Design an enzyme around this catalytic site. Sequence first.
Site, PDB file in Angstrom:
ATOM      1  N   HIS D  53       0.873  -1.181   0.000  1.00  0.00           N
ATOM      2  CA  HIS D  53       0.000   0.000   0.000  1.00  0.00           C
ATOM      3  C   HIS D  53       0.892   1.206   0.000  1.00  0.00           C
ATOM      4  O   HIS D  53       1.986   1.194   0.600  1.00  0.00           O
ATOM      5  CB  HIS D  53      -0.828   0.078   1.308  1.00  0.00           C
ATOM      6  CG  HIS D  53      -1.741  -1.087   1.585  1.00  0.00           C
ATOM      7  ND1 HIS D  53      -1.270  -2.256   2.118  1.00  0.00           N
ATOM      8  CD2 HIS D  53      -3.077  -1.276   1.352  1.00  0.00           C
ATOM      9  CE1 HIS D  53      -2.315  -3.120   2.163  1.00  0.00           C
ATOM     10  NE2 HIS D  53      -3.406  -2.549   1.726  1.00  0.00           N
ATOM     11  N   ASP D  56       2.433   1.867   3.341  1.00  0.00           N
ATOM     12  CA  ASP D  56       3.436   0.959   3.872  1.00  0.00           C
ATOM     13  C   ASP D  56       4.823   1.367   3.403  1.00  0.00           C
ATOM     14  O   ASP D  56       5.829   1.064   4.100  1.00  0.00           O
ATOM     15  CB  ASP D  56       3.225  -0.462   3.228  1.00  0.00           C
ATOM     16  CG  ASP D  56       1.913  -1.148   3.548  1.00  0.00           C
ATOM     17  OD1 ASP D  56       1.354  -0.891   4.637  1.00  0.00           O
ATOM     18  OD2 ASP D  56       1.456  -1.911   2.708  1.00  0.00           O
ATOM     19  N   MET D  87       2.376  -5.687  -8.052  1.00  0.00           N
ATOM     20  CA  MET D  87       1.075  -5.165  -7.649  1.00  0.00           C
ATOM     21  C   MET D  87       1.299  -4.099  -6.605  1.00  0.00           C
ATOM     22  O   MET D  87       2.216  -4.199  -5.765  1.00  0.00           O
ATOM     23  CB  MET D  87       0.188  -6.308  -7.120  1.00  0.00           C
ATOM     24  CG  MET D  87      -1.186  -5.896  -6.653  1.00  0.00           C
ATOM     25  SD  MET D  87      -1.272  -5.280  -4.948  1.00  0.00           S
ATOM     26  CE  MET D  87      -1.392  -6.833  -4.032  1.00  0.00           C
ATOM     27  N   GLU D 180     -11.007  -6.280  -4.655  1.00  0.00           N
ATOM     28  CA  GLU D 180     -10.897  -7.340  -3.672  1.00  0.00           C
ATOM     29  C   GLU D 180     -12.173  -7.362  -2.835  1.00  0.00           C
ATOM     30  O   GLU D 180     -12.396  -6.444  -2.016  1.00  0.00           O
ATOM     31  CB  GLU D 180      -9.691  -7.060  -2.793  1.00  0.00           C
ATOM     32  CG  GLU D 180      -9.479  -8.168  -1.739  1.00  0.00           C
ATOM     33  CD  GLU D 180      -8.156  -8.090  -1.072  1.00  0.00           C
ATOM     34  OE1 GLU D 180      -7.278  -7.332  -1.562  1.00  0.00           O
ATOM     35  OE2 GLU D 180      -7.984  -8.821  -0.039  1.00  0.00           O
ATOM     36  N   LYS D 182     -14.711  -8.566   0.268  1.00  0.00           N
ATOM     37  CA  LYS D 182     -14.662  -9.115   1.624  1.00  0.00           C
ATOM     38  C   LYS D 182     -16.032  -8.924   2.198  1.00  0.00           C
ATOM     39  O   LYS D 182     -16.674  -7.890   1.954  1.00  0.00           O
ATOM     40  CB  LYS D 182     -13.658  -8.351   2.485  1.00  0.00           C
ATOM     41  CG  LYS D 182     -13.379  -8.990   3.825  1.00  0.00           C
ATOM     42  CD  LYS D 182     -12.364  -8.218   4.653  1.00  0.00           C
ATOM     43  CE  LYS D 182     -12.000  -8.960   5.907  1.00  0.00           C
ATOM     44  NZ  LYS D 182     -11.031  -8.161   6.713  1.00  0.00           N
ATOM     45  N   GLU D 216      -9.491 -13.301  -2.105  1.00  0.00           N
ATOM     46  CA  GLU D 216      -8.652 -13.774  -1.024  1.00  0.00           C
ATOM     47  C   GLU D 216      -9.266 -14.995  -0.402  1.00  0.00           C
ATOM     48  O   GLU D 216     -10.467 -14.985  -0.067  1.00  0.00           O
ATOM     49  CB  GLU D 216      -8.465 -12.691   0.043  1.00  0.00           C
ATOM     50  CG  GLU D 216      -7.628 -13.156   1.222  1.00  0.00           C
ATOM     51  CD  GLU D 216      -7.309 -12.058   2.253  1.00  0.00           C
ATOM     52  OE1 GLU D 216      -6.820 -10.991   1.836  1.00  0.00           O
ATOM     53  OE2 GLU D 216      -7.571 -12.339   3.451  1.00  0.00           O
ATOM     54  N   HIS D 219     -11.293 -14.400   2.778  1.00  0.00           N
ATOM     55  CA  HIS D 219     -12.501 -13.541   2.631  1.00  0.00           C
ATOM     56  C   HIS D 219     -13.703 -14.323   2.176  1.00  0.00           C
ATOM     57  O   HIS D 219     -14.767 -14.203   2.745  1.00  0.00           O
ATOM     58  CB  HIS D 219     -12.181 -12.391   1.691  1.00  0.00           C
ATOM     59  CG  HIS D 219     -11.212 -11.429   2.247  1.00  0.00           C
ATOM     60  ND1 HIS D 219     -10.829 -10.276   1.552  1.00  0.00           N
ATOM     61  CD2 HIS D 219     -10.523 -11.423   3.428  1.00  0.00           C
ATOM     62  CE1 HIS D 219      -9.925  -9.648   2.284  1.00  0.00           C
ATOM     63  NE2 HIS D 219      -9.741 -10.265   3.420  1.00  0.00           N
ATOM     64  N   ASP D 244      -5.047 -13.509  -3.654  1.00  0.00           N
ATOM     65  CA  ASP D 244      -4.449 -13.442  -2.324  1.00  0.00           C
ATOM     66  C   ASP D 244      -4.609 -14.790  -1.639  1.00  0.00           C
ATOM     67  O   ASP D 244      -5.749 -15.279  -1.437  1.00  0.00           O
ATOM     68  CB  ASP D 244      -5.090 -12.379  -1.466  1.00  0.00           C
ATOM     69  CG  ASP D 244      -4.630 -10.985  -1.719  1.00  0.00           C
ATOM     70  OD1 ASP D 244      -3.749 -10.718  -2.521  1.00  0.00           O
ATOM     71  OD2 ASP D 244      -5.232 -10.074  -1.046  1.00  0.00           O
ATOM     72  N   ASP D 254     -11.207 -12.255  10.260  1.00  0.00           N
ATOM     73  CA  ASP D 254     -10.251 -12.557   9.252  1.00  0.00           C
ATOM     74  C   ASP D 254      -8.902 -12.944   9.902  1.00  0.00           C
ATOM     75  O   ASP D 254      -8.239 -12.101  10.519  1.00  0.00           O
ATOM     76  CB  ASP D 254     -10.138 -11.222   8.493  1.00  0.00           C
ATOM     77  CG  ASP D 254      -9.289 -11.240   7.409  1.00  0.00           C
ATOM     78  OD1 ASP D 254      -9.143 -12.227   6.594  1.00  0.00           O
ATOM     79  OD2 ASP D 254      -8.760 -10.166   6.974  1.00  0.00           O
ATOM     80  N   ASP D 256      -6.060 -14.549   8.488  1.00  0.00           N
ATOM     81  CA  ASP D 256      -4.817 -14.323   7.752  1.00  0.00           C
ATOM     82  C   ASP D 256      -3.766 -15.292   8.132  1.00  0.00           C
ATOM     83  O   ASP D 256      -2.568 -14.949   8.262  1.00  0.00           O
ATOM     84  CB  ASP D 256      -4.409 -12.835   7.875  1.00  0.00           C
ATOM     85  CG  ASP D 256      -5.205 -11.899   6.943  1.00  0.00           C
ATOM     86  OD1 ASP D 256      -6.216 -12.284   6.225  1.00  0.00           O
ATOM     87  OD2 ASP D 256      -5.099 -10.678   7.201  1.00  0.00           O
ATOM     88  N   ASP D 286      -1.305 -12.824   1.255  1.00  0.00           N
ATOM     89  CA  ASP D 286      -1.777 -11.750   2.138  1.00  0.00           C
ATOM     90  C   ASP D 286      -2.091 -12.439   3.440  1.00  0.00           C
ATOM     91  O   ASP D 286      -3.160 -12.993   3.631  1.00  0.00           O
ATOM     92  CB  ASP D 286      -2.991 -11.043   1.591  1.00  0.00           C
ATOM     93  CG  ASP D 286      -3.429  -9.942   2.495  1.00  0.00           C
ATOM     94  OD1 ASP D 286      -2.747  -9.651   3.492  1.00  0.00           O
ATOM     95  OD2 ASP D 286      -4.529  -9.348   2.262  1.00  0.00           O
TER      96      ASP D 286
HETATM   97 CO   LIG Z   1      -6.131  -9.313   0.874  1.00  0.00          CO
HETATM   98 CO   LIG Z   2      -7.855 -11.173   5.095  1.00  0.00          CO
END
Ligand SMILES: [Co+2]
Ligand SMILES: [Co+2]
Lengths: 386, 386, 386, 386
Positions: D53, D56, D87, D180, D182, D216, D219, D244, D254, D256, D286
């Site tokens: 991002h 980041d 990306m 994306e 979610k 993802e 998600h 993802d 979520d 991850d 991700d």
């Molecule tokens: Co993601």
């Molecule tokens: Co997630």
Amino acid sequence: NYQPTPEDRFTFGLWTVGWQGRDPFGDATRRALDPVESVRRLAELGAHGVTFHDDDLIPFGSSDSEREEHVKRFRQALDDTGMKVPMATTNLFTHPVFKDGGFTANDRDVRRYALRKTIRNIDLAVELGAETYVAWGGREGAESGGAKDVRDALDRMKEAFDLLGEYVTSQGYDIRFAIEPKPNEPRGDILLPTVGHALAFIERLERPELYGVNPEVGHEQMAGLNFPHGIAQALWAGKLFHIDLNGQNGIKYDQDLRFGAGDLRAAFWLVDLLESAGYSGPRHFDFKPPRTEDFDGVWASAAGCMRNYLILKERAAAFRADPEVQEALRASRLDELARPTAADGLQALLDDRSAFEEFDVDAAAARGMAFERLDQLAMDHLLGAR
Amino acid sequence: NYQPTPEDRFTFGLWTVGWQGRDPFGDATRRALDPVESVRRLAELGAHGVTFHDDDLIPFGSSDSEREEHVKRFRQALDDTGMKVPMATTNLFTHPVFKDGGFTANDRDVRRYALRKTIRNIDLAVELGAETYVAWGGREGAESGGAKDVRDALDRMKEAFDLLGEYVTSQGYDIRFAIEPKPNEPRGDILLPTVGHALAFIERLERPELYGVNPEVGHEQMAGLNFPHGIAQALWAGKLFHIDLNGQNGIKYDQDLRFGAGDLRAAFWLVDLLESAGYSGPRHFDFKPPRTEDFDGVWASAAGCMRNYLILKERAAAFRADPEVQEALRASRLDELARPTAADGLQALLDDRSAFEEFDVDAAAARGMAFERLDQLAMDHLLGAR
Amino acid sequence: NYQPTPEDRFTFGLWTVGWQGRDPFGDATRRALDPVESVRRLAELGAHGVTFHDDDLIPFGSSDSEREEHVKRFRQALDDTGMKVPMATTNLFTHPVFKDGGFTANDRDVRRYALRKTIRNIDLAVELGAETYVAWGGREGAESGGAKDVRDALDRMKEAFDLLGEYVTSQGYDIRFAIEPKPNEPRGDILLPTVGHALAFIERLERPELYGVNPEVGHEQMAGLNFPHGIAQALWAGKLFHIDLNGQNGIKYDQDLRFGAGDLRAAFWLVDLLESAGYSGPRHFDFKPPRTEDFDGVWASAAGCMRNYLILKERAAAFRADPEVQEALRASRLDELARPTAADGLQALLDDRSAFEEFDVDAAAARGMAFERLDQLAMDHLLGAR
Amino acid sequence: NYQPTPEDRFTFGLWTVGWQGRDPFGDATRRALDPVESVRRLAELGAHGVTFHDDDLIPFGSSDSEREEHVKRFRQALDDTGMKVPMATTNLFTHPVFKDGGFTANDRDVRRYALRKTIRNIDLAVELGAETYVAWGGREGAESGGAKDVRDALDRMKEAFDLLGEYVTSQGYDIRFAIEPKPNEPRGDILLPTVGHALAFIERLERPELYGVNPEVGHEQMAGLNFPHGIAQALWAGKLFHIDLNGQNGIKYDQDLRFGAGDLRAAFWLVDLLESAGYSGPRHFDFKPPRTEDFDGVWASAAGCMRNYLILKERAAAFRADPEVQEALRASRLDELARPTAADGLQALLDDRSAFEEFDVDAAAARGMAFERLDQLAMDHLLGAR
Ligand SMILES: [Co+2]
Ligand SMILES: [Co+2]
Ligand SMILES: [Co+2]
Ligand SMILES: [Co+2]
Ligand SMILES: [Co+2]
Ligand SMILES: [Co+2]
Ligand SMILES: [Co+2]
Ligand SMILES: [Co+2]
């Protein structure tokens, strides 16, 4: 109407209205609140009292002189407003030292620290007049199967609760414990994930009478469970020592919406049960005003918790008092559900041909339960459409 | 490889391989199986035994002479094959008379009938050698809040289980009960919805030692719970009297997939726990071959239940025996989790400055748990990728 | 009050009030209903019309003379009562031939049969005046990953829908199709599991204008989704051709409770949206009176569907018309949500320093959204507590 | 074995291995990582590249000279290691200004800011060589029904994506967008909650060819959906622009988890599908190393993502190449699923008595699908138990 007053026994955690809005994906949206200000604002709304984790009242790492001044200011706010402190709890989840647990951390030194941190705050709780000491073991659990042997963890959790019971007995304190289940979040799975698991665990403690549950609406709903049913089982067991009221939309992250939001009909049946059963503990809100809100929205959300409880209380009482409902309850055999099955005893049941050999199973099967008419009377009462 | 034999103690319900494929939306896809044929086919696969509801073995409404002939043929098949009958249960859910419950039906006459129906089959179970008598109260519960007062229903459920305990004691039978929780389906919410709720209930029975749980993989997963964790709590309580093995994909209708399907890693950790703990009861499959299958697919699905258990058993044992895993377990402090927190006692803990005043919280927080390396060793062992 | 009349456009499937109560675990609790009787009883309640699967109106395997007589009797009941038939559909799920699907069965002969069965009933639907032809592919999907290649299945599903579009065009019929998503049950996963997936699929059909969606409250809620949001996306797309109204408690088997049961606040927001948007299609109930009920309870449950819609309609309209709500909507910037972001165009946005270089991000962040006050006004209106 | 190299096209977000461990209930457990260090460590593990991002890589509020130096150091690390940047994306969720959304914020000034923030980072993305620009609208949605009119919000979301398409076209950039989905978290419900909803939305953009999806694993699993099925629908649509990879245990917050954790069999079927279909995009992770871990555990967790993909790739390829599996696929009619239903055309189907009048429905119903044998071959291949 629906105006709360302190007689209604509504309480709020400092961390509820004080939540600054940080979430997994977001920074704070509101400034920190001084506990003194939250006590004053909540009293203005008609709350009865407030609750705290240790670290909400006294910043972690405070010196003795800082501790004393934070407590002094809080006590002044309580005295200025008439607010009470019925419950307190320990923060065994925020600091990184608790990343694998407090009482069930794999590191033994952390387990011992968690106990000392708790004991220090039990003394404070008693000083402030609290009757109930909650324990939410939010870090007790695992993300992976090898990381946590659950039998060993339950051994450690029993040792911790037993030590806490020995401590309160040694001091002659009247305070009792309330264990708060949650199925997951922040751990992938949390130990004692539901009311049932916590009730079962308590029966294996050395002094079970010192411990009950602190169920939270949204926590049981995170497992898709019926919160009123779980409360009924806790009441049946004599273990509803405290309760956390909020809203949740089913199986998600813990939303902590204001009470009445989320599953509204479950909120209705909950209030009906608490009032029917004569639950006499605090009606405590563990909720978070959404991070979209400013401070005016914080106080509106808090006020809405209490308003919704009072609306639901009125509607549930009207339902139970309505002669038409009373007749529908008898048509649905709720009265027969409350009669013993075989007060005549086992041998009489065995000798009763009406119970087997001469039971007309087809006639009994054909009798409708009339539950839909009963439930639509309940809907009509909730909605004010009678 | 992975060939089961009767020594492995794999068992199957008659209703599993015998399921004809009727679902909410569909007619039967397979003809009915004679229990004699299922006993012979299961024995050929290497099963140890079978289980039954009353009405799977003896059609509902059978005369005494029909009953006797059905039992005689079944006993011959058992004797022909060496198959055992370790467990039996009552069907208190199919017949329309049980539409509001058996033991907790609002109609008292139905409650009394359900008890007589159960007692009749306990006698048969004992005749056939069963050690465990399961009770799945699938109709106990509600779709609406007014239909069922849960405290009254729990009073009726306790009276029923207490009467059954008095019956077995009066007869001098050795059989014990195993209560099977499920959160929902066919009722909107079922009473005793999880292992925890059932364990808690048992502690309030008059003779708790006669009762344990019969958890089912898919049932706890229908609440999104961790099945191995719940089994660990049942083992901790000394209450794992029986277990039902199958597969489930999370929070849905009860799928009853073959064991190993659904959540494969949960299946691995379950087997690891049962084997570690030395569980000595039957490994019973309560599953349904999908209705897409013909009879060849039924027997393939049954064989796959046993094969998957045996694969997982090998991999879990290799994981625990691997020196590299043993070192990773110590790096993650699983050994310290198993040590008492404060065998030195409360006063010593209170006087221990290393537990509070001189505890270096930052140093402890900085120590990683090493759980991801441990879990990837577990993954590598499961997948045969070491 | 809240009395429905045919002007309200409430419709019911024959299979709703006609459900005999068979479930995964239970036999029928009610006798079969003659469609003529359901048409008469529903008309008495104030329904506008009824809908049918082929096999609800004409038993599967009927001769031509039996078919003709069943249709003749049904047409007489419609004419006697003034009831309409706005929608019809095909049963591609009950018969065992459809155990792997209709349009996406792996067996090609079954796919061709499913199409012929559908086409036969489209002709009947048109005869009876239906404007919409629903397709719920409840058997399209899988319990295992190898059993169904989803790209190939979507190719077959597109061929089937394209053929059906060619058929209706060839006949000059005005009828349009509505695809009904569901995420699971009876298949472990169903293809086109949500409104979004179905909308996306339709855009790849040869004549997308002939196809829309038939969303069902409980189906989207079986995925934990927000049903009003999904309806809004369908409306945004111009694709809400029909809707199925019922109740569901979150992530479970498909409960088919009466409308208003299950998630009551979602029911409120749904009605608000349908009425706001001026949806002009049938308000169709796809529900099942619980199997606890006799026929009196069936008709009470059906009446409750309509009553709850009408209560919610009144409350949603009062909410939107209340000047205090209108002011709260402006305080929460709902008016600004409805204004274009950049009608000034891309280059103007790029040159606008107020959008970046001179945007006071902190001032904008500090402005509360006032959503909790708005939502408590919505709660107060729903509950009749203003 | 199973050693990744850059040819495998594994990529990671800076925010993955760089996650400091803050969660709803917990402070950071790890220090911040310099992106330069993450690029070097990931390259050492065999990664191909990294993603970011805006915020980041360049702290929010940075001056132009700080921006330039952060980018210069990052470019040096890329050049030192050979790592790519395939990306990039915008952070439209952390800062409090986005508390009600970026592109669908009710405040118009915020919507315009979100677009300018995105456009600035598209230019950077292109500078760094990215082919794909992801948009996760994590703040787009609501906790309450009145707060967000979804039709108006979808109008604003379409205007935003259309402006972004006009921007990239105006600049002659080759980059494409990947939306994306979610379903929830951090908002109570998020707009475009699943792959299907996002695919449907894209078809209404002015230049749909510029947009695809970035699904993802976790998600779609937060809605209980089948991730491989959703990927198949995205591939069918030609819209899988990016993916993802991670792990999730069903319907929760979520999680991850590292790829391969969570639903292992879904991970197997996903890899099988990506490899079968010849997906040529990055295999992007991700994920978040659990907060229990130190930096050694971060890199172990990252390495495990890649290892699990490679194990699964080997097993899926062995499954598809095994002659016994190929024969089981034909026994289950997967070959027939791939043949057109009616290439002979509508009129031929209508005239084909084998499709209706002379179709032996009972014979077709009796033919088993053989899916359980096929699935146990898949299990045996996954587990290395052939
Ligand atoms: Co993601
Ligand atoms: Co997630
Ligand atoms: Co909570
Ligand atoms: Co709480
Ligand atoms: Co089951
Ligand atoms: Co079972
Ligand atoms: Co449904
Ligand atoms: Co429907």
